[PDB]
Point group: C3
Chain length 154, copies 3
């Protein structure tokens, strides 16, 4: 019954000349995020480190071994370290905030990737999608934000 | 036992001509929130949190933005239906916490009413429901009064 | 068991010439956070997350610096019959570098809450040069807290 909660936040700029990868899914778009800059996976990664009280993603996977590694590999490495700390992942919930493109047709693909990387049943992983209602830098489409929550148990 | 956590987020534009409804409370104000339904930013975030905890997807999947029945829909009715589907999935709600962010109007006089509405809708005692009011300290679009944001967290358990 | 979760949010403008205090740690900087108190954005967010979890409202409902207020928050939480299990948090700041001060923050929080270090976590992020946070006009903090009655 030694439960712990963690929360995660990430945001990246939307720029031309980059692929758009969210939840490990390459989504056809005129711009991508400036890592593979996978905003969803980084937020989930941070939430997991947070729940296990192991610091944050920048400390574990800096700009100094993990060069060229995609965010799915970083998530798998995160999960491994959480497990070595003696914690089991119970569930993950998340929200992506993007004005465009449409993300709903890609939700299930994202869930399956995350579930596989965390060795979780599909019914313990959730991904939600929101616009920012044309408000702020998100609403003007300058970037994409992700929020995450994770529950673990020792 | 089988606990699950969920988180929710929502934001709506503030515009003339619309009623301002937050946490089911109609608040006297010259502007209101713009959306397909009554645009109740707080109830939508709580809703998303509850679907999220139960891994049922999100508010848009369950109550489509493109349906004339949900045009001007009572978000309290949406919250109650959400709660019903979470229960059908086999989950009991343990607690909800939430934040509302607005430059204006003052929301503190209405927090108790919001909490009561949420508690009733979810069939929870008052001490399992919390709503916190904030400003954005004059920063960004929220500081410029362009819209209102809500954040929510919910804990459930698979019965 | 009667677990409860809470979530906290806070943001303050960066102005001259106030000192920069985050997680009870004074950090050398040309600007500092503007508020009625010491404007400790991290501690305010944690404080609200804890009041949220115990359903005791928020900070601007009950009430000395932010550390004293966090200590008072912990008192009211225990009074209501709750024990704190863990806190997680994120500071969003484009500048200055927060990594060197993270473990001191965490020490402060653990002491004020009477928790061992391994139940307290603080994470730092930039805003990738986006918005008011990206232009260094303010600093935001987010927090989550798990309690049990
Ligand atoms: N103001 C800040 C922001 C981030 N950081 C550190 O730099 C790392 C990378 O930051 P981002 O991933 O937000 O670009 C973070 O994990 C954090 O530890 C810092 O030391 N001071
Ligand atoms: N980028 C986005 C944002 C929202 N959506 C979907 O459209 C529905 C309406 O979006 P919002 O609720 O943010 O207006 C959402 O539930 C979301 O699932 C999407 O498919 N892609
Ligand atoms: Zn990232
Ligand atoms: Zn909404
Ligand atoms: Zn504050």
């Amino acid at each position: 019954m030694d439960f712990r909660i963690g929360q995660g936040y990430d945001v990246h700029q939307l720029v031309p000349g980059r692929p758009l990868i969210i939840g490990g899914v390459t989504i056809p778009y005129e711009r991508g995020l400036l890592s593979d800059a996978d905003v969803l996976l980084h937020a989930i990664t941070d939430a997991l480190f947070g729940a296990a009280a192991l610091g944050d993603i920048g400390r574990h996977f800096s700009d100094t071994r993990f060069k060229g590694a995609d965010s799915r590999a970083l998530l798998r490495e995160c999960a491994s370290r959480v497990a070595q700390a003696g914690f089991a992942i119970r569930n993950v919930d998340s929200t992506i905030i993007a004005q465009a493109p449409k993300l709903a047709p890609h939700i299930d693909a994202m869930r399956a990737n995350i579930a596989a990387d965390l060795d979780l049943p599909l019914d313990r992983v959730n991904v939600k999608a929101k616009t920012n209602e044309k408000l702020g830098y998100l609403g003007r489409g300058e970037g994409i934000e992700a929020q995450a929550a994770a529950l673990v148990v020792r």
